[PDB]
Each structure stands twice: as structure tokens, then as C-alpha cells.
Amino acid sequence: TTGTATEPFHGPHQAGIATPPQAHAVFLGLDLRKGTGRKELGRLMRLLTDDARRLTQGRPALADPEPDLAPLPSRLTFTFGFGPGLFKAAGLEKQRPEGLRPLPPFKVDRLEDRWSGGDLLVQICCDDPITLAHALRMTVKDARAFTRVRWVQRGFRRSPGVQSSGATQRNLMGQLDGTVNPVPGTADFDQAVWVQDGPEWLRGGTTLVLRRIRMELEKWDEADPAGKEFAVGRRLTSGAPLTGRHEHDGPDFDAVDSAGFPVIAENAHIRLAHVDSPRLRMLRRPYNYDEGLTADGRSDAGLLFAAYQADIDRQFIPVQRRLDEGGDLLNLWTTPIGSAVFAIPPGCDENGWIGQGLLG
Amino acid sequence: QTTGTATEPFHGPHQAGIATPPQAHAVFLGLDLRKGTGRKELGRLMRLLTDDARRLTQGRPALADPEPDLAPLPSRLTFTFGFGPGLFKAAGLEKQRPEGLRPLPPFKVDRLEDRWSGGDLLVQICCDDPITLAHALRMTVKDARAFTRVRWVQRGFRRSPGVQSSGATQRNLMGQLDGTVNPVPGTADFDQAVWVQDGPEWLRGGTTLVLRRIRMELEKWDEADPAGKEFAVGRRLTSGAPLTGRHEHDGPDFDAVDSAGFPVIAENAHIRLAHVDSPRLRMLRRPYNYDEGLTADGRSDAGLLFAAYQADIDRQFIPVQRRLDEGGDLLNLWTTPIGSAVFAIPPGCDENGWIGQGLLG
Numbered sequence A: 001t002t003g004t005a006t007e008p009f010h011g012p013h014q015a016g017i018a019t020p021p022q023a024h025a026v027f028l029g030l031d032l033r034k035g036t037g038r039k040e041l042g043r044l045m046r047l048l049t050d051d052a053r054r055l056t057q058g059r060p061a062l063a064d065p066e067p068d069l070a071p072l073p074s075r076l077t078f079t080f081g082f083g084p085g086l087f088k089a090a091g092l093e094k095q096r097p098e099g100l101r102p103l104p105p106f107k108v109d110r111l112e113d114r115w116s117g118g119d120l121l122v123q124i125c126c127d128d129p130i131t132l133a134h135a136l137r138m139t140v141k142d143a144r145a146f147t148r149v150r151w152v153q154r155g156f157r158r159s160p161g162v163q164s165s166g167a168t169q170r171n172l173m174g175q176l177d178g179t180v181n182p183v184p185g186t187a188d189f190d191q192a193v194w195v196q197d198g199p200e201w202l203r204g205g206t207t208l209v210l211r212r213i214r215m216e217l218e219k220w221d222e223a224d225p226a227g228k229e230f231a232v233g234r235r236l237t238s239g240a241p242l243t244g245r246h247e248h249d250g251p252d253f254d255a256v257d258s259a260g261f262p263v264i265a266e267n268a269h270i271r272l273a274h275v276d277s278p279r280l281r282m283l284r285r286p287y288n289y290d291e292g293l294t295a296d297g298r299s300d301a302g303l304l305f306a307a308y309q310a311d312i313d314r315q316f317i318p319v320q321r322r323l324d325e326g327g328d329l330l331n332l333w334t335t336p337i338g339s340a341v342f343a344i345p346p347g348c349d350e351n352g353w354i355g356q357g358l359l360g
Numbered sequence B: 001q002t003t004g005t006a007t008e009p010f011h012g013p014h015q016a017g018i019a020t021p022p023q024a025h026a027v028f029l030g031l032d033l034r035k036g037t038g039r040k041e042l043g044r045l046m047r048l049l050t051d052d053a054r055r056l057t058q059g060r061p062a063l064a065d066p067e068p069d070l071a072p073l074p075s076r077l078t079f080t081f082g083f084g085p086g087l088f089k090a091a092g093l094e095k096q097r098p099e100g101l102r103p104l105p106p107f108k109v110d111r112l113e114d115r116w117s118g119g120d121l122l123v124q125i126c127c128d129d130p131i132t133l134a135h136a137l138r139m140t141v142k143d144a145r146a147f148t149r150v151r152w153v154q155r156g157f158r159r160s161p162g163v164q165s166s167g168a169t170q171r172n173l174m175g176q177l178d179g180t181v182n183p184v185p186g187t188a189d190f191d192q193a194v195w196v197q198d199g200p201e202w203l204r205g206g207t208t209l210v211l212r213r214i215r216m217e218l219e220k221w222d223e224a225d226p227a228g229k230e231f232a233v234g235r236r237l238t239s240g241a242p243l244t245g246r247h248e249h250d251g252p253d254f255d256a257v258d259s260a261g262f263p264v265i266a267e268n269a270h271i272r273l274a275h276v277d278s279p280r281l282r283m284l285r286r287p288y289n290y291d292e293g294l295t296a297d298g299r300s301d302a303g304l305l306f307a308a309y310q311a312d313i314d315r316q317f318i319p320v321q322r323r324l325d326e327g328g329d330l331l332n333l334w335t336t337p338i339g340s341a342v343f344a345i346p347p348g349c350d351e352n353g354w355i356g357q358g359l360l361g
């Protein structure tokens, strides 16, 4: 049984980033109350740090309302992120990374305030949804005095044990999603993900772009099946690029067909999204969402697109701009409806707290 | 075999999803019939839904599946179909409606909402994997959409597969072990309690389902005295033992008194008011937990999808629910029914039949 497994909470980095993605996630987006300044932010982060320090190791939080739900931690992780408004309220505008600001507008955007923005992120991931529900309850108990809930975004992947560790999993459009990604334990991953420039407090942390993207599954089902593969540039069942045979073959963007036209379309998703230099890649760590049905049977489902990178301006915005300006074929069936950005501090040890180097 | 490749048989004398040890995830899909959906249309629908379930539960794509790659990894997927009271009117088969198939009478604790209540047709889908479940739900809707409107969709969860040993009792979102006293599948008392053997012929080998969405007032629960929380139920939180005993499965001693001469298990303790002596009159509780979103000041929207299966609602559910209500169950201070629905669940089918054929055929 796997309920007893844990992920380390202490370290140079926060967990939940390089951690192989767990089956369940909640992204909790918080807005600061009017009186919540730097002093209050420190009191809040010390509370939340200790909650996570205990719950992730299967121990009840201080003042835990339901201690019996804290055993079976099931690889629970907490990742805390600071939005642009956090630096304003703390009086630390000098410490805000230049690129930490709301993303520029893109033509595909249909963004809603109720899924965008936020001053404080608590990302909670877990292989078990009861442990996750309890961890969310404790977080809100300790954050209530300082913050309002702006949004809560719940997502899922495969249950633990359904697929072998590391195997690519499918999204709700049926596509293998995650083939091209930096790999933890390599020098390229560290360069792509962990901050080493900019303000000193953020070194060893990262940045997160969180976009709620709706899937138009009505239109998608009507779509030509060959057209669906052409829009991505990979086959549905195998995940292979249209130029190859296996999932992990390298897409050949110079290949043309017997008529002279590119095998992978000039506006195929993976052509527009691709970056040559592995150290400029973003870490994609997405979750799926599925939420209820209209009377006439229309789904409300999509992707919680979570991208981690050392530099938003150098690693996320150029890709998103190419998808938009290049007219990504996948845009016919996907729609961004929420967008938020966060600076994720480095980790801490037993005698520290998350954000201490910024707020202390 | 893995958690993803494991299957549950679809064919049998009974529908799966009842005696099946509860899987990690569930969705209860509640449907209303459209105006033109009569007996003929219901037969076409039930044949479509049966064949989709027959395929998907075994890891094969449904007929005309728009996302066939999501159908492998069935992860113990089961479907359970149920017929609400309004179904028999639309089919012209009022004579075949069981006397006891009707909306529950009102109870003082009820704060029922229409958006969580009623329904002509139930599709209960359970699965160890949420992606497989999501795909199965979409295939169900794809085939039912022409004949029905969606009245509600209620999603719930238990522990992930492999988190606890199988058969071990699991906790609810109040932290309580939930499911200790239950008919055990594969026993004679289970068959007597669950499977219908009287009434209209088509329902023999089926059961009845009471589905109640019960909100947990977790703000009040947190402020509650911890001794009072155990006292309200009659069992200890950590061990799950009755207050009169030491281990989870010890029989509660309803005659024991404390040093003051008062019952150790209170007169209005949940397990005292809910208890029935005859094991063959017990209900099968197969609940799921739900947790859906937060107010701006951090108040939870969480509770229990209370799913009770029994041969006879009038003999096995209503008297218990009435004792809880009139007896003033201490647990009522922290729980609120906000939805209620009742369904007749037909017997199973074979490789050539379809669910409901004995009624709609």
C-alpha cells in the first residue's frame, strides 16, 4: 500500500515542481485582505509552513480540526507562490522579478476574472483526494484571517498505479500530454526551472504560469480524426510525430510530403510550441479538470496548464506568442479562460519558513 | 494485472456497482426524460447504454467512441442503471412500479434542493481512475442526450486505490470511520437485505437506491467539543470502537451505563437510533465523499453522497431515517440533507440481453 509514502518538505527547493506529478491537485488562489501587510504575511507564512511541514509527513497540523485525516499522506506536497500584489502589500516592489506581471493579451484569450490573478498561491498535490481535502481545509483555516479565496482550481491525472511511473498520460481530448519536458536530475532541468539571476531571495525558486484552458469537446468530437492529429503534429494512439513511428522520436520539422507540403503543419501545435535549446524549455506539469453538465448535455472540462520556468519573459511568453500569432490549429478547440502568474520561493529547513528570505 | 487493467464483470444476475467493493471514484448522473421519450425510445436508449457499458467496462471503446484511446485502462469501471418513479408514467407501465418506489416523505432536518433531487433515470458510474470515469460519463451523455436532459451530476470520491488495504474501513470528511456495520457481499444476510424477491417480477434480483446529498457543517463541527463529537456518534474517532468497547468491530453495548447511570451510548446517539437488530433488515451503505469549492471567506461545500441500497425502502430505509429524525440524532447538529432521489435498480443481464429488458421489452 502507498498511503504511507511521503515527499520531503524541506530542501533547497519546494516540493511539487520536480516531484513526479501526483494523481490530484488543488490550486488555491488567495487575495490579501486590506490590513495584510508584511508583518501579517510573515505570520501567515509561518503558520502555513508548519502546517505543511507536519501534514506532508503524516502528522496533524497544529490546531488540526481532523487529525485522523492526516495519516496516509500519500505523497502530499505544498508549493507556495507569491503574486504581483503580494509584493505591493509587503512593500517589496524592489524585490519583484521584472517578469512577474500579468501576461500580455493574446487574441485567443477569453479570460475571466474569477479564474485569473491572485496574490498568494497554495498549490497542494496528493495521490489521495481525502488527504488532499483535509490539507485544503487546514490551509484555509489558517489563511482565513489574512486572505479571501479568489479561486480554487481542482484537477486530476491517473490514479496511482494505473500507469507505470514516468509513462506519459493522456488528457481529456485523448492526447498523450507531456512527451517533451525537462527531466529532473539533469543539468538542463536545473537551468530551465531554477532561478539563478534576478533578486537574490528567489534563487533556487521558480516562476509559475497557471492558465485554465477550456476544451471545446463538442466541436472536438465532430472533428475529422485525421484533422485532429494534423492540428497537433502527432498521432493519437502512439503519440509519435507524424514524421516518425514512436512517441519519443524527434519531430522532423523539415519533412515534406509527396506533394511538397510540410508533414507537420506550419501551424501545428508542436511546431509553434517547439524550442530548439533544451535549457529554454518550460516544465509543463498540467492537471485535467471536469466539472458538470448543462441540461442539454454539454461538458465543462479542460486543462489546468501549469508551466514552471526560471524566466517568464524568456521561456513562456515567446512560446505563447508564437501559438497566438502563428494561428495554432489547436486554438480551434481550446480557449484560455483564466491566467495567473506567481513567483515560487526556494525551500526551507527545520529552522526556516517559506518566503523568509523575502519577508523576514 | 494492474490497477488500470483490472476489470469487474458487467454481466451477471445482478448489476455491478452494488456488491462491488466501492471503487475510488463515482459519478451519479441524474436524468429527466424529454417529452417525446416513451417506451419505445427507452428501449433503444437502454440497449445503447447497455452495449456501451459492456464495451467500456472491459476496456474496449464504445460504439462510435469519439475518444477511443481513453477506453483502455478500465480500472474496475462499473455502471449501475436505475429507474425513478416518473419513468413508469412515461413508459405506460404504472402497474409495474413498485409500491415503495416514490420520493421519500419529508423529514424535519430536510433542506432539500430541486437541483439535487428526483430524476427519472440514474446512471451510477464507479471507477478506480478519474480519467476513465470522465470518458465513461461523456459516452453515457453522448448516447442519452437525444432522449433526456441532465437533472444533476454528483461526483464523489473515496481513498485512492492502494492507499489502504482492501476491506479496511475508510474515513469520511468529518474524520470518522464510515461503513463498519454493513451487510457483507457474498453472505446470505446481504442477499436478504439487498436483492428484491417480492413485488413486480421484473425487479427480482434488483434493488432500490436512496441517494441523499448530505452537507457537512464543517464550521460548526470544528467548534465542537471533541468528546461531544464522539458522543454524538457513539464511537471513538481514532479506533472506531463503540464507546463501550475497544476495537472497531466490537458489538456496541446499548445497555451499558456510565458512572452517573446514564447510557454510555447516548439515547440519541447516531448508531443507537440507526441500529436495527435483524441483520436481514439492514441497509447497504455505499457512500462517497464530496468536496466542491469555497466561499470567499473560506467556508467549505463538502459532505456525503449517502447511497443506501435495500430491497424495501418502506421496511429498511424509512424507519431508520424516521428514528434519526424523531429521535433527535445528535449528528443532525452538523449534517443537512440537501438532495434526495430514489431509484429502482433492475437485475443484471447476460451477453444478449439489456438492462431493463424485463420491464421495457
Ligand code: HEM
Binding pocket: A171, A173, A175, A176, A177, A178, A179, A180, A181, A211, A213, A214, A215, A232, A234, A251, A269, A270, A273, A274, A275, A302, A303, A305, A316, A319, A320, A323, A330, A334
Ligand atoms: C488545452 C490546451 C493544450 C493542449 C490540449 C495541448 C496539447 C499538447 C500535446 C498533445 C502536445 C504533444 C505531446 C507533448 O510533447 O506533450 C503538446 C506539446 C507542447 N505544448 Fe501544448 N497543449 C495545450 C496548451 C499549450 C500551451 C498554452 C502552451 C504554451 C506555451 C503549450 C506548450 C507546449 C509545448 C512547449 C509542447 C512541446 C512541443 C515540442 O517541443 O515538441 N501547450 N501540447
Ligand code: HEM
Binding pocket: B172, B174, B176, B177, B178, B179, B180, B181, B182, B214, B215, B216, B233, B235, B270, B271, B274, B275, B276, B283, B303, B304, B306, B317, B320, B321, B324, B335
Ligand atoms: C453525513 C451524514 C452521516 C454521517 C457523517 C454518518 C456517519 C456514520 C458513522 C460514523 C457511523 C458509525 C460507523 C459505521 O458503522 O459506519 C454510522 C453508522 C450508521 N449510519 Fe450513519 N451517517 C450519516 C448519515 C446517515 C443516514 C442519513 C442514515 C439513514 C439511514 C445513516 C445510517 C447509518 C447506519 C444504519 C449505521 C450503522 C449503525 C449500526 O447499526 O451500528 N447514516 N454513520
